[PDB]
Amino acid sequence: YTSFNTVDEWLDAIKMSQYKESFASAGFTTFDIVSQMTVEDILRVGVTLAGHQKKILNSIQVMRAQM
């Protein structure tokens, strides 16, 4: 996944239109901070939406995978 420009291009691949300013509060606006959390953090950013919360759960690993 080294073809992304910013968290906007990454969250876009997982369908996160209503998760922009939401990730800015927790600090997931780049390829690093968001690569150090789990499902407990998704519920904090405001991802109460079911399914969507578990979707980014495996996405957070896309960063630690190559890191």
PDB file of C-alpha atoms in Angstrom:
ATOM      1  CA  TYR A   1       0.000   0.000   0.000  1.00  0.00           C
ATOM      2  CA  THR A   2       2.816   2.476  -0.790  1.00  0.00           C
ATOM      3  CA  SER A   3       0.646   4.379  -3.299  1.00  0.00           C
ATOM      4  CA  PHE A   4      -1.221   6.562  -0.772  1.00  0.00           C
ATOM      5  CA  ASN A   5      -0.651  10.328  -0.402  1.00  0.00           C
ATOM      6  CA  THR A   6      -2.076  10.765   3.120  1.00  0.00           C
ATOM      7  CA  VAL A   7      -4.523   9.224   5.627  1.00  0.00           C
ATOM      8  CA  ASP A   8      -7.188  10.622   3.273  1.00  0.00           C
ATOM      9  CA  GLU A   9      -6.101   8.173   0.550  1.00  0.00           C
ATOM     10  CA  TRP A  10      -5.858   5.293   3.054  1.00  0.00           C
ATOM     11  CA  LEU A  11      -9.184   5.829   4.873  1.00  0.00           C
ATOM     12  CA  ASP A  12     -10.729   6.276   1.406  1.00  0.00           C
ATOM     13  CA  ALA A  13      -9.808   2.677   0.506  1.00  0.00           C
ATOM     14  CA  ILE A  14     -11.708   1.456   3.595  1.00  0.00           C
ATOM     15  CA  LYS A  15     -14.742   3.725   2.997  1.00  0.00           C
ATOM     16  CA  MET A  16     -14.279   6.294   5.797  1.00  0.00           C
ATOM     17  CA  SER A  17     -15.955   9.432   4.387  1.00  0.00           C
ATOM     18  CA  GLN A  18     -17.325  10.407   7.830  1.00  0.00           C
ATOM     19  CA  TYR A  19     -13.995   9.687   9.570  1.00  0.00           C
ATOM     20  CA  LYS A  20     -11.892  12.705   8.521  1.00  0.00           C
ATOM     21  CA  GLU A  21     -12.053  15.212  11.407  1.00  0.00           C
ATOM     22  CA  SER A  22     -12.805  12.171  13.599  1.00  0.00           C
ATOM     23  CA  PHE A  23      -9.273  10.779  13.152  1.00  0.00           C
ATOM     24  CA  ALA A  24      -7.785  14.276  13.577  1.00  0.00           C
ATOM     25  CA  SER A  25      -8.919  14.297  17.229  1.00  0.00           C
ATOM     26  CA  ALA A  26      -7.225  11.005  18.191  1.00  0.00           C
ATOM     27  CA  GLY A  27      -4.182  11.839  16.031  1.00  0.00           C
ATOM     28  CA  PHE A  28      -4.675   9.386  13.138  1.00  0.00           C
ATOM     29  CA  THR A  29      -4.082  12.035  10.440  1.00  0.00           C
ATOM     30  CA  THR A  30      -0.804  10.497   9.190  1.00  0.00           C
ATOM     31  CA  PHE A  31       1.042   7.181   8.694  1.00  0.00           C
ATOM     32  CA  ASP A  32       2.341   6.650  12.250  1.00  0.00           C
ATOM     33  CA  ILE A  33       0.076   7.604  15.189  1.00  0.00           C
ATOM     34  CA  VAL A  34      -2.843   5.614  13.731  1.00  0.00           C
ATOM     35  CA  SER A  35      -0.346   2.732  13.363  1.00  0.00           C
ATOM     36  CA  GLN A  36      -0.228   2.161  17.140  1.00  0.00           C
ATOM     37  CA  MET A  37      -3.762   1.448  18.406  1.00  0.00           C
ATOM     38  CA  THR A  38      -6.600  -1.104  18.178  1.00  0.00           C
ATOM     39  CA  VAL A  39     -10.416  -1.338  18.342  1.00  0.00           C
ATOM     40  CA  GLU A  40     -10.448   0.572  21.656  1.00  0.00           C
ATOM     41  CA  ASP A  41      -9.149   3.673  19.833  1.00  0.00           C
ATOM     42  CA  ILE A  42     -11.652   3.400  16.955  1.00  0.00           C
ATOM     43  CA  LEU A  43     -14.543   3.743  19.434  1.00  0.00           C
ATOM     44  CA  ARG A  44     -12.905   6.933  20.772  1.00  0.00           C
ATOM     45  CA  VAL A  45     -12.480   8.743  17.431  1.00  0.00           C
ATOM     46  CA  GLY A  46     -16.278   8.408  17.131  1.00  0.00           C
ATOM     47  CA  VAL A  47     -16.514   5.249  14.991  1.00  0.00           C
ATOM     48  CA  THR A  48     -19.565   3.974  16.914  1.00  0.00           C
ATOM     49  CA  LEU A  49     -20.891   2.747  13.541  1.00  0.00           C
ATOM     50  CA  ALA A  50     -20.844  -1.071  13.766  1.00  0.00           C
ATOM     51  CA  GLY A  51     -18.782  -2.942  11.147  1.00  0.00           C
ATOM     52  CA  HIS A  52     -16.973   0.294  10.208  1.00  0.00           C
ATOM     53  CA  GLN A  53     -15.273   0.134  13.627  1.00  0.00           C
ATOM     54  CA  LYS A  54     -14.018  -3.405  12.907  1.00  0.00           C
ATOM     55  CA  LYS A  55     -13.077  -2.397   9.342  1.00  0.00           C
ATOM     56  CA  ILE A  56     -10.288   0.005  10.378  1.00  0.00           C
ATOM     57  CA  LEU A  57      -9.317  -2.512  13.099  1.00  0.00           C
ATOM     58  CA  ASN A  58      -7.397  -4.607  10.544  1.00  0.00           C
ATOM     59  CA  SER A  59      -6.458  -1.451   8.598  1.00  0.00           C
ATOM     60  CA  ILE A  60      -4.319  -0.120  11.480  1.00  0.00           C
ATOM     61  CA  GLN A  61      -2.076  -3.124  10.721  1.00  0.00           C
ATOM     62  CA  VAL A  62      -1.414  -1.948   7.137  1.00  0.00           C
ATOM     63  CA  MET A  63       1.122   0.439   8.713  1.00  0.00           C
ATOM     64  CA  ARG A  64       2.854  -1.791  11.288  1.00  0.00           C
ATOM     65  CA  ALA A  65       2.965  -4.453   8.544  1.00  0.00           C
ATOM     66  CA  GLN A  66       5.832  -2.744   6.680  1.00  0.00           C
ATOM     67  CA  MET A  67       7.014  -0.721   9.704  1.00  0.00           C
TER      68      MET A  67
END
